[PDB]
Swiss-Prot record:
Assembly with partners or alone: Homodimer, probably forms a complex with cognate toxin YutE.
InterPro entries: YutD-like, YutD-like_sf
Disulfide-linked positions: C88-C92
Cited Gene3D superfamilies: 3.50.4.20
Function: Probable antitoxin component of a putative type VII toxin-antitoxin (TA) system. Probably neutralizes cognate toxin YutE.
Protein name, entry field: Putative antitoxin YutD
Pfam families recorded: YutD-like
Record's keyword annotation contains Signal: no
Keywords: Disulfide bond, Toxin-antitoxin system
Length: 110
């Protein structure tokens, strides 16, 4: 039941055995190598990795589950908007990856 009948995808980023999905991307700020180079194990804690190019230096800042289970916009972080505005304001680039409540990586074990 791993990979629960999933025929849904988009831009899923699997790193350090953690499954992520690119939910929001502006100005094509999503640079994969940059992300995975800026990534850190402690970030897996947050279940949400926000990457902004504010101040030039790419920041990966994690947030906690903002939406309630009854929210259809699972990927929306209401406190995020004000955060981005402080750093990556109009005339900038940023991206948001969401950490999935599972990990489907077919490791052919013996």
């Amino acid at each position: 039941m791993i990979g629960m009948s999933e025929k849904r995808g988009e831009i899923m980023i699997l790193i350090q055995n953690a499954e992520f999905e690119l939910v929001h991307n502006f100005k094509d700020g999503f640079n994969e190598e940059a992300f995975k180079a800026r990534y850190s194990d402690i970030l897996n804690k947050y279940d949400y990795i926000v990457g902004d190019w504010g101040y030039g230096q790419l920041r990966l800042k994690g947030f906690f589950d903002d939406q309630n289970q009854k929210a259809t916009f699972e990927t929306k972080i209401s406190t995020l908007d004000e955060y981005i505005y402080e750093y990556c304001n109009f005339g900038c680039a940023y991206f948001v990856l969401k950490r999935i409540r599972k990990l489907e990586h077919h490791h052919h074990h013996h």
